[PDB]
Amino acid sequence: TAQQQLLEQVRLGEATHREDLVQQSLYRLELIDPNNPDVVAARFRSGAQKQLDRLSQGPSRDVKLTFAQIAPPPGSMVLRGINPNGSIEFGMRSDEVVTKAMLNLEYTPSPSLLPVQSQLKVYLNDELMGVLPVTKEQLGKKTLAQMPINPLFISDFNRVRLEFVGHYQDVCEKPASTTLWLDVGRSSGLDLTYQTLNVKNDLSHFPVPFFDPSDNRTNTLPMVFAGAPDVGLQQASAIVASWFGSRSGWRGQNFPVLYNQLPDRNAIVFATNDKRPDFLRDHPAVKAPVIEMINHPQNPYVKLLVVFGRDDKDLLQAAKGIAQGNILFRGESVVVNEVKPLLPRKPYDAPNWVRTDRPVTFGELKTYEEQLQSSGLEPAAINVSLNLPPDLYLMRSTGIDMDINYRYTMPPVKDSSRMDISLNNQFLQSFNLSSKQEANRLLLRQGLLDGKTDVSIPALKLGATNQLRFDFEYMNPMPGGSVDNCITFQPVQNHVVIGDDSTIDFSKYYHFIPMPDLRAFANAGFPFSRMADLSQTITVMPKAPNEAQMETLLNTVGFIGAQTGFPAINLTVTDDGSTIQGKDADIMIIGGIPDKLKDDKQIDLLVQATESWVKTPMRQTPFPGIVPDESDRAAETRSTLTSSGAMAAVIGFQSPYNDQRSVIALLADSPRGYEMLNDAVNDSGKRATMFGSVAVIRESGINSLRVGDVYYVGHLPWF
């Protein structure tokens, strides 16, 4: 049984005195079956009296994880004497257990390294589990190696570390030399199998059965309705999708929808008191909004979440309660009472976005403790990734001012070691590390130096996302002395630390951005992401939406709430285009166009049935400047073509009701085109290839362009 392996892991962890493994195993055995006396006794070992009180009272998946997918970008790894460690990380869900795991390697040792002495080691969260010595027959040839992985040592989050220690000379070998290396091919990878378990129908660990942060793959939980949902039900589903997208984050969001059809995976079921789904028939009527989880009628391995309410208002209340907290999930059939309204949100208050009104310390930008430090012969570059609003604008002034406090080891040379600051892989400035020792006396034979630096960056172009990089480049002397009698310096590991007191400020920027620019929409959700809860957005959805339109709306709202750090609890989904007249908000149109906005002549592309037309700009440049050129973006020709092919596009134009407000519409003509539009929307890689004002999505790919009038949104004072 799986619980037997869980208890074996439990006793293994206590034998190794590792609290992380045992705690995860307990969480798992309690998830699968918390009723047996064994789990309550094991929890007693891990207050203590309560455990004694209650004590007295499947399908499997085979996956391939090659180095080309879960390694640094190039995939291939080169291990040297300065960077001999290489890590590969993967995660296991809390509802699945790994039975068999195998590691396959394909490496080529350098021809010059000494045999036997040079060996390659593997570490699965430490726990040295084998060494691979280098023989004479494999000194300079490609080798195939296979080594099993013990399943009992695998936890929720774990990595495998490849340590390469090698030598090429007995005496006077040069460190950091290129003669020693060990290239690891990208074809190498792991080989493990996961097995699902029939977890208990308990809502206490919400939403682990439906979404667990341990899984690093895309979260694709579907949704099921009764068919042709009403306006309020669409709003509730959009709110739930936004909350789930915010919770998932960068994993990827995809919410397929079904109409009165059972799914084949964990899904959310929306069922009012009336028009109940066919499989939910004979469920007793409810008087209050209630949330419960029920097993799939066919197999118990699929867990379904059912949201029940008297009417669409109760469903909206339940969705708003789910988006917020204080629900206190426990057992099943948890009811949601009146939910307090959310407090008003200041613009640009997204939790993910870095604060702009006040200086931001490096401590809050740090995600894990070991991010702001490095060690080794050549310390690794410290990377600090910060998400920024996409409308930051600089108007002839000093840009990002940042104070840096750092600690570094004393360099061997006086005035050679430098610290390099790079933004978006662009060199910014260099600072020389001080030293108090001459090189001539280095052949003769304890503190840590401190440093303070003030840095100002022009930063004309920032973008939706960016990262920093601090490179500490030392000079390491080679062996010297006389030729007949040489002396080699023993390598010493040097540590570089960036203090948390370092602050970065963006208070000298302005919220100005040319429009229409859907690249910011693709990367940050602008302008709907200006309000974290989407309190200034109206969604125009077609009457009686089909599956494709519901899926497109769900995916768009999920990605918008994923780029933003907060769910959209105040989104307003409408059914007709007449109500948006005389309103001050950003209108997002899904699958179609209102007749009043379709003949305003600001539209640069309109796909209607088999006929579509586009306004070609005058001249398109691959790399535009900061200031848009109106002459270049002026329309030149309008060509209309008709064909049976499937196509979709996303366009943006100024709202005809307000100068500041903007309208972005997603349009499709055929179900295939809807499929391609969904795929482009939910895919992060494809969504980053769109810019300008019109972005067509054909089978070849996405070919965007910029055309039309330019309207500026924001506040810009005198100059």
| Triad 358, 363, 366: Cα angle to 5° | 115
Q: Which of 174, 45, 29 lies closest to 112, judged by CA?
A: 174
Question: Running DSSP on this structure, what letter comes out for residue 600?
Answer: S
As to burial, measured by CB atoms within 10 angstroms (0-12 exposed, 13-18 middle, 19+ buried), residue 225 is buried
- CA 706 vs. chain centroid, Å, equals 29
Pair of tokens at residue 39: 């789990």
Q: Is the dihedral of CA 613, 618, 622, 623 positive or negative?
A: negative
As to burial, measured by CB atoms within 10 angstroms (0-12 exposed, 13-18 middle, 19+ buried), residue 134 is buried
Cα–Cα distance for residue pair 79/167, rounded to 1 Å: 13
Q: In degrees rounded to 5, what are phi and psi of residue 23?
A: -65, -45
The identity of residue 137, as a single letter, is E
10, 26 Cβ separation under 8 angstroms: yes
3-state SS, one letter per residue, for 551-586: HHHHHHHHHHHHHCCCCCCCCEEECCCCCCCCCCCE
Question: Running DSSP on this structure, what letter comes out for residue 415?
Answer: S
Q: In degrees rounded to 5, what are phi and psi of residue 61?
A: -125, 130
Cα–Cα distance for residue pair 325/243, rounded to 1 Å: 11
The SS3 assignment for 481 reads strand
User: Rg of the chain's alpha carbons, rounded to an integer?
Assistant: 30
| Triad 531, 532, 534: Cα angle to 5° | 60
The SS3 assignment for 64 reads strand
383, 420 Cβ separation under 8 angstroms: no
Pair of tokens at residue 355: 């604060």
Pair of tokens at residue 485: 């009698």
568, 534 Cβ separation under 8 angstroms: yes
DSSP conformation letters of 163-189: EEE--S-SSSPPTT-TT--EEE-TT-E
Domains, the chain:
2-57 (no CATH), 62-196 (2.60.120.260), 223-335 (3.30.379.10), 360-477+492-508 (2.60.120.260), 514-714 (no CATH)
| Triad 120, 123, 128: Cα angle to 5° | 85
Q: Which residue has the tokens 């989904």?
A: 573
327, 321 Cβ separation under 8 angstroms: yes
- Sheet containing strand 334-335, strands side by side: 257-259, 223-225, 267-272, 303-309, 290-295, 334-335
Distances (CA, A) of 284 to 203, 273, 276, 281, 290: 20, 9, 11, 9, 12
598, 606 Cβ separation under 8 angstroms: yes
Helix ranges (DSSP H) in 389-528: 518-524
Question: Running DSSP on this structure, what letter comes out for residue 370?
Answer: G
88, 190 Cβ separation under 8 angstroms: yes
186, 76 Cβ separation under 8 angstroms: yes
Beta-carbon-side half-sphere exposure of residue 374 (alpha carbons within 13 Å): 19
The SS3 assignment for 206 reads coil
Pair of tokens at residue 213: 């942060």
Pair of tokens at residue 620: 């398109």
Contacts of 493 (CB under 8 A, 6+ apart): 375, 376, 377
Beta bridge partners of 78: 183
The SS3 assignment for 404 reads strand
Beta-strand relationship, 96-109 and 119-124: unpaired
- Sheet containing strand 418-423, strands side by side: 382-387, 465-473, 418-423, 427-432
402: region left, alpha or beta (phi > 0 left; psi from -120 to 50 alpha): beta
Q: Which residue has the tokens 């005195």?
A: 17
Question: Running DSSP on this structure, what letter comes out for residue 171?
Answer: S
Question: Running DSSP on this structure, what letter comes out for residue 617?
Answer: E
Distances (CA, A) of 350 to 246, 524, 529, 537, 677: 11, 11, 8, 16, 27
Q: Which of 535, 523, 539 lies closest to 567, judged by CA?
A: 535
Report the length, in residues, of the chain.
Answer: 719
Pair of tokens at residue 556: 């768009």
Contacts of 48 (CB under 8 A, 6+ apart): none
Q: Which of 317, 310, 338 lies closest to 236, judged by CA?
A: 317
- Print burial letters for 548-574: b (CB count within 10 Å at least 16), e (below 16): bbbbbbbbbbbbbbbbbbbbbbbbbbb
In 116-262, beta strands by DSSP E = 119-124, 128-133, 143-149, 157-165, 182-184, 189-196, 223-225, 257-259
Cα–Cα distance for residue pair 707/692, rounded to 1 Å: 7
Q: In degrees rounded to 5, what are phi and psi of residue 158?
A: -155, 160
Q: Which of 163, 334, 196 lies closest to 265, judged by CA?
A: 196
The identity of residue 302, as a single letter, is V
DSSP conformation letters of 684-695: HHHHTT--BSEE
Cα–Cα distance for residue pair 125/159, rounded to 1 Å: 6
554, 241 Cβ separation under 8 angstroms: yes
The identity of residue 228, as a single letter, is A
89, 158 Cβ separation under 8 angstroms: yes
Range 46-51, long-range pairs (CB < 8 A, 24+ positions): 46/22
The SS3 assignment for 672 reads helix
DSSP conformation letters of 217-253: S-B---EEESSS--HHHHHHHHHHHHHHHHHHGGG-B
Resolution given for this structure, in angstroms: 3.2
6, 29 Cβ separation under 8 angstroms: yes
Q: In degrees rounded to 5, what are phi and psi of residue 246?
A: -65, -40
Cα–Cα distance for residue pair 285/306, rounded to 1 Å: 13
Q: How far apart are the first and last CA of the chain?
A: 74
Residues followed by a gap in the chain, C→N > 2.5 Å: 46, 57, 445
Q: Which of 553, 591, 593 lies closest to 573, judged by CA?
A: 553
Pair of tokens at residue 352: 């993910």
Cα–Cα distance for residue pair 156/176, rounded to 1 Å: 36
Distances (CA, A) of 387 to 351, 434, 619, 626: 10, 33, 32, 20
As to burial, measured by CB atoms within 10 angstroms (0-12 exposed, 13-18 middle, 19+ buried), residue 1 is exposed
Q: Is the dihedral of CA 167, 170, 175, 180 positive or negative?
A: negative
559, 517 Cβ separation under 8 angstroms: no
The identity of residue 718, as a single letter, is W
600: region left, alpha or beta (phi > 0 left; psi from -120 to 50 alpha): alpha
DSSP conformation letters of 281-292: TTPPP-SS-EEE
Q: Which of 655, 369, 389 lies closest to 500, judged by CA?
A: 369
Count Cβ atoms below 10 Å from residue 422 Cβ, excluding itself: 16
Segment holding 673, helix H or strand E: helix 671-682
